Amino acid sequence: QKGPKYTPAAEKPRGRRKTAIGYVVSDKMQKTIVVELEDRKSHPLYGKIIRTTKKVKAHDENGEAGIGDRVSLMETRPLSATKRWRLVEILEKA
Amino acid sequence: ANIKSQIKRIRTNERRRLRNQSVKSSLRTAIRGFREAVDAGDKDKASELLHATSRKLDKAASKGVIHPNQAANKKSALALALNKL
Amino acid sequence: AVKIKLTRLGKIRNPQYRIIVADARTRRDGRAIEVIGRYHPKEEPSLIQIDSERAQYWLGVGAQPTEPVLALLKITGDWQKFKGLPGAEGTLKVKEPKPSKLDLFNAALAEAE
Amino acid sequence: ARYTGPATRKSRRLGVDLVGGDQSFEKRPYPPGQHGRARIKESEYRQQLQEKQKARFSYGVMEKQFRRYYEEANRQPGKTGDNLLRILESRLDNVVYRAGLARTRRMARQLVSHGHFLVNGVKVDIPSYRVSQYDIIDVKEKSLNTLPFQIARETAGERPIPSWLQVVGERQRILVHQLPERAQIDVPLTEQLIVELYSK
RNA sequence: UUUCGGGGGUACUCGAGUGGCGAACGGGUGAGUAACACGUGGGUGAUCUGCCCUGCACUUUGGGAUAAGCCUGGGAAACUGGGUCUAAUACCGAAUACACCCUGCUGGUCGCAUGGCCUGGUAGGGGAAAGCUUUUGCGGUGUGGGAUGGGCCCGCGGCCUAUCAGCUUGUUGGUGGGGUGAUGGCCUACCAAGGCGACGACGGGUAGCCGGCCUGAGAGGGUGACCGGCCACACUGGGACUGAGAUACGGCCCAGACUCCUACGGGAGGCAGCAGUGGGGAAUAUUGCACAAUGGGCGCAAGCCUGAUGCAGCGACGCCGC
Ligand SMILES: [Mg+2]
Ligand SMILES: [Mg+2]
Ligand SMILES: [Mg+2]
Ligand SMILES: [Mg+2]
Ligand SMILES: [Mg+2]
Ligand SMILES: [Mg+2]
Ligand SMILES: [Mg+2]
Ligand SMILES: [Mg+2]
Ligand SMILES: [Mg+2]
Ligand SMILES: [Mg+2]
Ligand SMILES: [Mg+2]
Ligand SMILES: [Mg+2]
Ligand SMILES: [Mg+2]
Ligand SMILES: [Mg+2]
Ligand SMILES: [Mg+2]
Ligand SMILES: [Mg+2]
């Protein structure tokens, strides 16, 4: 009687990284763009839908997204202080 | 200083510090010697001392003085330096 | 090590215990990973319930029972089963269910009439 | 604690029979004291309050315990006034009185408290013990020949026994087929005023 | 064995000592903290994990010491030096490992860009161990998987104050190095001139957070005692060491305040553990009894330890019953 010398690891499903869409408000740093994300929440007490804007710093290697363009982003590990997003695709240039 | 076991541990912690310090110093001297060889530019000497330094890093990880991942990082950096230079 | 412990519930002089899977370091009345049973020693026979499916899983992965929990696992047969030894049926005693109240009401009706 | 002072003066203030056999009430149906004759200004609060006093000084329940009864009744799914009345009716000292083994609810309390009754074979000396469906109440051996209990055996007839109660034996064995509905309960009181009192 | 003053042996046993494991848990307090501290939901293709469980391989070979012991020195004390001597699962060199770590080349495949996976294939270099027991017998090393416990990052959520409008120069971003278990100005050199702010930045005030609790028809308001979960601290401030793991309450080093000892050279303390004392105050308890039960540490086990805990004492302090 003898068992296997190698035991394969159990399959874990790879997690769901968050995605977002925004507009580029800045590209004055090397390989980084500042993107504004827009969110709609219901006010806790008054119930009105409130629109809020969050700046995000995203990594793009090649500078392919300029100011004013609409872009898609995905979460990633910390690439520097602040930066936690990477540019996936420049979705609609303007 | 109040509890018997702590008093004994004072002695034993010191013994271990000395052992670990000595090993870490040896590792540091070895890495320094390799670095100087690479900055001097002598591929042959540098390659010989990469191998001895690398094995010393591995053995220090076996004694528990450094973490295996730290040994891997050091070894990787040295080998990359020799390939580039 | 992850262990199978008794955690104390109930009030003074009425110790009621839940059978929980918890890290050794966790305090007795602390957060548990699972509750897999209960144990009431003040009863006769002492009440014992174990979720045998979960007990088998936890012993499988290497949870270490405490001394009283090991006694309970032998009574239930979950220990003998896990090891492969015989006795898996266990020797669990259950309190004789007391007469139903409706039947005793009918008994009193008949007796006096 | 218990209220152990004069019993007639309470019925006299409230203007209704609480013991219901009381000659001194019918002789002086006005409130007690020097000013018991004088005209009292009407108020809704006094009416609500006195209905509560009639309830609690009939059954002999202190205000603390009575207020807990109210909260349970209001919590229960029925209508609060019916639930409150039948909870107080479930009390063992009351069940003993309704069965006839006692003369007054005061006498019923003392008997239950002194340890003369058993419920489903276990001694109970808690007057506030609430009977449930299919409870059987019996008398311990020592108290069966006990002189006032002997009186109670051959004094059957003072009042009628309600349908949910039943005395089945000369042993004076009481059976409870169910909790009384409002129709079954017969009490000289308007329960809606007490529900309103505690909604203040 | 005796003479009865003692003197040997045994190792059942065991003081002191070496060595292993534990001492990072458990218990306390809420000073600080307006912060990824906490709550809730995610991410890790960016990571560690002693003891426990379950596969595979192995456990070869040598060496030099030292505590204890004995002799002796210095010191008032705390403590400390020298000589001589002894052992190990203490320490140290080598072989073997080719699962594993590093580097070069190269094939397939999955994605979410770095990349991940196929223990992919291949060349070169390298990485361990420990014995004891004779009995329910316990151990040691590498490596695959699991279980447990974590680390780090992010969305969203919960105070007052513009009579606080600008703040920031490792500061915002990049590349080459360093550092860590791991990502990252975390650190560093150079280069670019950015980053955050009336969706209140930067200041000031207050405050541990939560499950919950109180009130209220609800919405809301107030609050966070006990019990339970996180966090923070341990005379004050700073620092690292040992370790799988450290705010290291009953560890270490330094500086300060305070108390104490001294031979004046120098030493020794830390109840926000349990109980208790003084003090402050309107006000809050016993210098109990047990490890019998439950949880924890070590031990093959018998067992030992446990002011965790289980209980007892005192106060109508509260609720409930009589
Ligand atoms: Mg590196
Ligand atoms: Mg009372
Ligand atoms: Mg000893
Ligand atoms: Mg601690
Ligand atoms: Mg060793
Ligand atoms: Mg780098
Ligand atoms: Mg504070
Ligand atoms: Mg309102
Ligand atoms: Mg360390
Ligand atoms: Mg202390
Ligand atoms: Mg300590
Ligand atoms: Mg104290
Ligand atoms: Mg005072
Ligand atoms: Mg135990
Ligand atoms: Mg045993
Ligand atoms: Mg002790």
Swiss-Prot record, chain A:
Residues 1-18 are annotated as: Disordered. GO terms for molecular function: rRNA binding; structural constituent of ribosome. GO terms for biological process: translation. Part of the 30S ribosomal subunit. One of the primary rRNA binding proteins, it binds specifically to the 5'-end of 16S ribosomal RNA. NCBIfam families: PRK05610.1 (NF004123), uS17_bact (TIGR03635). This is Small ribosomal subunit protein uS17.
Swiss-Prot record, chain B:
GO terms for biological process: translation. Residues 1-21 are annotated as: Disordered. The keyword Lyase does not apply. GO terms for cellular component: cytosol; small ribosomal subunit. Residues 6-19 have a biased composition (Basic residues). The keyword Ribonucleoprotein applies. Belongs to the bacterial ribosomal protein bS20 family. HAMAP family: Ribosomal_bS20. This is Small ribosomal subunit protein bS20.
Swiss-Prot record, chain C:
Keywords: Ribonucleoprotein, Ribosomal protein. The keyword Cell cycle does not apply. This is Small ribosomal subunit protein bS16. GO terms for cellular component: cytoplasm; small ribosomal subunit. It comes from Mycolicibacterium smegmatis (strain ATCC 700084 / mc(2)155). GO terms for biological process: translation. The chain holds residues 2 to 114 of 156 of the full protein. Belongs to the bacterial ribosomal protein bS16 family. GO terms for molecular function: structural constituent of ribosome. The keyword Thylakoid does not apply. Transmembrane segments: none annotated.
UniProtKB/Swiss-Prot annotation, chain D:
Residues 90-156 form the S4 RNA-binding domain. Gene3D superfamilies: Ribosomal Protein S4 Delta 41, Chain A, domain 1, RNA-binding S4 domain. It comes from the Bacteria. Residues 1-41 are annotated as: Disordered. Disulfide bonds: none annotated. One of its GO terms (molecular function) is structural constituent of ribosome. GO terms for cellular component: small ribosomal subunit. Belongs to the universal ribosomal protein uS4 family. This is Small ribosomal subunit protein uS4. It comes from Mycolicibacterium smegmatis (strain ATCC 700084 / mc(2)155). The gene is rpsD.
